Design an enzyme around this catalytic site. Structure first.
Site, PDB file in Angstrom:
ATOM      1  N   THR C  13       0.825  -1.224   0.000  1.00 20.07           N
ATOM      2  CA  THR C  13       0.000   0.000   0.000  1.00 20.07           C
ATOM      3  C   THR C  13       0.845   1.254   0.000  1.00 20.07           C
ATOM      4  O   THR C  13       0.416   2.261  -0.570  1.00 20.07           O
ATOM      5  CB  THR C  13      -0.988  -0.078   1.172  1.00 20.07           C
ATOM      6  OG1 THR C  13      -1.947  -1.094   0.867  1.00 20.07           O
ATOM      7  CG2 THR C  13      -1.764   1.206   1.398  1.00 20.07           C
ATOM      8  N   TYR C  27      -8.168   0.641  -3.605  1.00 17.41           N
ATOM      9  CA  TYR C  27      -7.077   1.047  -4.464  1.00 17.41           C
ATOM     10  C   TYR C  27      -6.170  -0.105  -4.873  1.00 17.41           C
ATOM     11  O   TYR C  27      -6.525  -1.275  -4.664  1.00 17.41           O
ATOM     12  CB  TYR C  27      -6.206   2.082  -3.713  1.00 17.41           C
ATOM     13  CG  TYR C  27      -5.779   1.460  -2.398  1.00 17.41           C
ATOM     14  CD1 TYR C  27      -4.622   0.705  -2.338  1.00 17.41           C
ATOM     15  CD2 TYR C  27      -6.493   1.599  -1.220  1.00 17.41           C
ATOM     16  CE1 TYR C  27      -4.220   0.136  -1.139  1.00 17.41           C
ATOM     17  CE2 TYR C  27      -6.096   1.029  -0.017  1.00 17.41           C
ATOM     18  CZ  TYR C  27      -4.927   0.281   0.042  1.00 17.41           C
ATOM     19  OH  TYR C  27      -4.492  -0.350   1.216  1.00 17.41           O
ATOM     20  N   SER C  60       1.086  -7.375  -0.242  1.00 17.97           N
ATOM     21  CA  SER C  60       1.787  -8.346   0.614  1.00 17.97           C
ATOM     22  C   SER C  60       0.995  -9.589   0.952  1.00 17.97           C
ATOM     23  O   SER C  60       1.643 -10.589   1.368  1.00 17.97           O
ATOM     24  CB  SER C  60       2.365  -7.722   1.871  1.00 17.97           C
ATOM     25  OG  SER C  60       1.391  -7.406   2.855  1.00 17.97           O
ATOM     26  N   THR C  93       1.684  -3.966   4.543  1.00 17.93           N
ATOM     27  CA  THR C  93       1.451  -4.191   5.967  1.00 17.93           C
ATOM     28  C   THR C  93       0.936  -5.582   6.298  1.00 17.93           C
ATOM     29  O   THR C  93       1.249  -6.094   7.388  1.00 17.93           O
ATOM     30  CB  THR C  93       0.436  -3.184   6.534  1.00 17.93           C
ATOM     31  OG1 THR C  93      -0.814  -3.352   5.836  1.00 17.93           O
ATOM     32  CG2 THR C  93       0.909  -1.736   6.465  1.00 17.93           C
ATOM     33  N   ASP C  94       0.110  -6.188   5.448  1.00 20.61           N
ATOM     34  CA  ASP C  94      -0.611  -7.398   5.853  1.00 20.61           C
ATOM     35  C   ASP C  94       0.324  -8.514   6.321  1.00 20.61           C
ATOM     36  O   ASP C  94      -0.010  -9.196   7.277  1.00 20.61           O
ATOM     37  CB  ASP C  94      -1.450  -7.924   4.691  1.00 20.61           C
ATOM     38  CG  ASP C  94      -2.665  -7.104   4.361  1.00 20.61           C
ATOM     39  OD1 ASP C  94      -2.977  -6.147   5.106  1.00 20.61           O
ATOM     40  OD2 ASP C  94      -3.315  -7.473   3.358  1.00 20.61           O
ATOM     41  N   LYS C 166       0.551  -6.884  13.257  1.00 19.17           N
ATOM     42  CA  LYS C 166      -0.585  -6.068  12.829  1.00 19.17           C
ATOM     43  C   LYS C 166      -1.789  -6.487  13.697  1.00 19.17           C
ATOM     44  O   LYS C 166      -2.292  -7.593  13.552  1.00 19.17           O
ATOM     45  CB  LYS C 166      -0.821  -6.260  11.322  1.00 19.17           C
ATOM     46  CG  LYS C 166      -1.850  -5.288  10.742  1.00 19.17           C
ATOM     47  CD  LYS C 166      -1.986  -5.418   9.233  1.00 19.17           C
ATOM     48  CE  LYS C 166      -2.998  -4.428   8.691  1.00 19.17           C
ATOM     49  NZ  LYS C 166      -2.987  -4.306   7.208  1.00 19.17           N
ATOM     50  N   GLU C 287       0.748 -33.432  29.074  1.00 15.88           N
ATOM     51  CA  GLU C 287      -0.463 -34.218  28.839  1.00 15.88           C
ATOM     52  C   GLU C 287      -1.081 -33.886  27.502  1.00 15.88           C
ATOM     53  O   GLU C 287      -2.102 -34.481  27.183  1.00 15.88           O
ATOM     54  CB  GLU C 287      -1.523 -33.950  29.898  1.00 15.88           C
ATOM     55  CG  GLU C 287      -1.068 -33.930  31.347  1.00 15.88           C
ATOM     56  CD  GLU C 287      -1.461 -35.234  32.003  1.00 15.88           C
ATOM     57  OE1 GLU C 287      -1.927 -36.109  31.219  1.00 15.88           O
ATOM     58  OE2 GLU C 287      -1.311 -35.345  33.213  1.00 15.88           O
TER      59      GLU C 287
END
Lengths: 325, 325, 325, 325
Positions: C13, C27, C60, C93-94, C166, C287
């Site tokens: 972005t 966008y 991304s 960013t993702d 994020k 366990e």
């Protein structure tokens, strides 16, 4: 071979009592002796060879710098001994951030110094003090805890004395360092260390207080709409050596505060601009009076300024301390 | 048809203009006119029919009660008009929480009143003010925004004036209500309303100041180790009607603060115990002097105490206001 | 004089263009070239001698391990040059937390590696990318930045690749490390370093992947009420070497999840129990089947498990990696 | 004269037991009966006339939709009685957000429904369950608590079922609604109500699940670098009616996820794009497949999608449920 841990007690809600288990407000802080706390969580004796020492027994709103000074000296004495591996200090929550930061700057040892506190009295339903104390002993006795600066342990968290603060009046999870995080956490009887603070402290600190019996007087003045000049005048008249300003926003100053600060500076008082907001950086600004507090909150800024004033009144030197401690 | 929104400008960093794009500290707050703010975001004309009015042009550390009172009176006049559907108030960040909470208590309309601010000046690289102002106009113009109390819009968030506070000196995301959250958010050009505040405000508030020109004097005193009694004496002597105490922990008071508060009470001054911590409840405690601030922080507690003192000096009545407003 | 910084562009972005300044959620990510980013914030040229290199230009969510491997190789080649002082990587960013943590483990240099991203496209009103990029170049060129591990710079904050995530779908302030805080902050054109991470990385890491052109397959399966066994079966059948479980609470497992994990273990897969909650420690529990993720969230756990599997399939070795990286 | 409260027990760590006080991980959830919980805190009998009912005794990772259906039916039956003023439901922490949100959508009453849980077992040092239970009974019996939607009470906080989530694997303070805050807090034996949720619930809900014995199948798939198409294929083959996608960022989808979602849509599966991040809004985007989850996290989105599918498979109707519930 168990670590040798002194539990140095000062009071607080951790040692507090009320008549019934439902009373969690308005109880008596600083009522129970250190050995009663130890014996309420006797699992500590599996983690360490523990010795209780009753230093004081007060509510922490009544802790004073001359007493904190004595506390620091006693802890330095203890940690100089080969038979002491660490110290846990039981203290009230209200002003632990002040006492802990003082010791962070003045204890010349890499051995652990762990403050512990509780938000509920020892008599309360679901009292937090027993687990907090167990965690604190675990932290103090672990070899991996050395060299980390002074710590505050409560609610499964390990906070640095430089960053941690009481953020909520009344909740168990009140101690947080929003921007800086915790040094570590204690979960399932295991310590998880996350961060090392990137600041000077303890063995690398210049703030030697051996032999002292008093500290420079520093008051804190709030910033707000209509804040009055007269509070500056009053502080000056009563002999302060520093004023910490809990400022609006990024240490911003009204026309009235500027007039009061200029009077203080003329009289040789060091003015330090912090923030009322709770967090973040007060940046330099040559158009405003005084020094800036970096990320120190008002309570912490007062402690560092008091200690700075034992060594210097040079504003350039003091400003550099605020960027490095 | 589009809503009719007045943009009522008071100053602030949102209207500040520095010499370079990189200066984000040390610029001049309250330099640009309202129409220059509007014309930097001409997209606003698709959200509302907007009209700018210049109320003042100051940095918000200089906003005063007498001026905030005039602001409330002007907003009441605007919202009484059929051709005004809501008002956006451009303001500085440092004391927006004080001005906004005052209007929250004194605006006699359900039409939206939205304060907006910016943490970076209008000249800055990545300045926040343009988007904040667009978001505030969208909020003020939406029918679903009616009856929510006064709002603060910034960084995609909608905060209640009663809960929102500036929590960080310097970051874009400084406005938070840690325990109470946001009333709503603005994402993708759409409003998402989350909460309605469970407190009295605006059209259900007893506080009416349209026939006043100033408010009762209230000062704020900080709580900390070694806090001095003499600051209480100084406030009393300068004619305060109330003292708000930014107390240690849950409004806890040292022996010196108690002596100061008892002197204030003997002179008819109302004492209100809040907290320096940042968040949470100061609970009642009959063993301590004064009233308690509920979840109001010091800055908000001072505003409510000033307004309370326009109506009563009965501590029982004032205490009830602090639990309901 | 100035540091030599390479800006290695991958998309995101931060490089996106939309048709209006109001488009913030529709966008195209990865559309503008690296010299367009640089020339839009030409102030970077006063902080560093900058050279742009276009590595890729994608959103991304489409970044893949095979490409991340090539990114790590290129960064290692750049940082091996004496004429390169640091690298800034523009990215979406993702999945920046995934790419950044990979390079944190695989880059064999102490020179700064700073990922930067933006939540609003380059065309947006109040776009965040320009300031984020300027901050990132400042961080990458500061000598104090060496040896800190890989960093993610955005919204005035410096996060460690190991802790930062994020946390919000859509806000500018989305990148947070709630329990661990920020390594540092950038305020007023100055860096404030707060913490050093207490974990292994970069020059102290065993995870060298130079020479590889593929990685072990690792999938992530969610934990929830009624979670199905058949997703475990499907993963096994498709040749995973590892499964990361985004578990209920502290990696807790339903009867169905336990059946699926046991099948995976039977079929030679390494099972790693993380948490869907967002934060905190998944503690050991013998366990339950599988390893535990310490404080690694699912996305980070997958990266570490994939890199672990290039070196070993020994559960004890892998478990110790999760407690130390 | 006291309120009549049923304590409807389902299991959880609140009913957990371990052999020593220091075991806080790895213990048996759902081991103790409801009357044992009540008898540990006989103080409850001063707040309410209480009656325990043992509905189930399981760890909450094993709670299933068929059992939650029965829980909702039982609570509806209890609240229809004149002699029941409210219900406290003891439950595990791991999936309380799922069970509580289901009841929030299906219990057709304004009487309080208060889920309570504990992060430490009943045998632990400083176990939280006793005080959590007392607080929950106080909340359920207070007239002021009516009409608020389903609540989760723990650690002095009152969270809405629609917003509250377990945010940390292991800490006492794990339940938070970062963006939405708490409905209220309980301090000093007094309730402080802060917010009313601005959403449809309980008496205004359309989700009638009388006579149902099972729910539409809905699975959750994670989003991450290299996410596989084959997990969509597997879910389709196993007859899911819905897929919730715990997406990268704001529900963003890789090329592989898009192919999987288009296959699902062609087979009539409803696809719902949420976020793995933890918080915030997934906005609409007509260029991507499926619906968007508003501010619902994956676990909550699955509950609402299941219930939506009891009324319709129309994607525009389901989208509107996600914007209003």
């Amino acid at each position: 071979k168990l670590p040798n841990i002194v539990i140095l007690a000062t009071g607080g809600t951790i040692a507090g009592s009320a008549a019934t288990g439902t009373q969690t407000t308005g109880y008596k802080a600083g009522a129970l002796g250190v050995d009663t706390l130890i014996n309420a969580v006797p699992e500590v004796k599996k983690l360490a060879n523990v010795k209780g020492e009753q230093f004081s027994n007060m509510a922490s709103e009544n802790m004073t710098g001359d007493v904190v000074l004595k506390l620091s000296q006693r802890v330095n004495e203890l940690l100089a001994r080969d038979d002491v591996d660490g110290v846990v200090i039981t203290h009230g929550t209200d002003t632990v951030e002040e006492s802990a930061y003082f010791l962070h700057l003045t204890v010349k040892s890499d051995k652990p110094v762990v403050f512990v506190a509780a938000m509920r009295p020892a008599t309360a339903i679901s009292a937090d003090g027993p687990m907090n104390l167990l965690e604190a002993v675990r932290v103090a006795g672990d070899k991996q805890s050395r060299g980390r600066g002074v710590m505050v342990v409560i609610n499964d968290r390990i906070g640095s004395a430089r960053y941690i603060t009481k953020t909520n009046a009344s909740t168990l999870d009140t101690f947080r360092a929003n921007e800086e995080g915790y040094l570590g956490v204690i979960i399932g009887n295991r310590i998880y260390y996350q961060n090392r603070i990137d600041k000077l402290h303890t063995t690398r600190s210049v703030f030697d207080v051996r032999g002292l019996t008093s500290l420079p007087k520093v008051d804190i003045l709030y910033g707000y709409q209509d804040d009055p000049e007269y509070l500056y005048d009053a502080a000056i008249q009563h002999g302060v050596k520093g004023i910490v300003y809990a400022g609006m926003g990024a240490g911003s100053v009204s026309v009235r505060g500027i007039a009061g600060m200029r009077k203080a500076l003329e009289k040789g008082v060091v003015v330090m601009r912090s923030t009322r907001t709770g967090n973040g950086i007060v940046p330099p600004d040559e158009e405003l009076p005084g020094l800036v507090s970096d990320s120190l909150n008002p309570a912490h800024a007062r402690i560092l300024l008091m200690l700075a004033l034992t060594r210097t009144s040079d504003p350039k030197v003091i400003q550099e301390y605020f960027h490095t401690y």
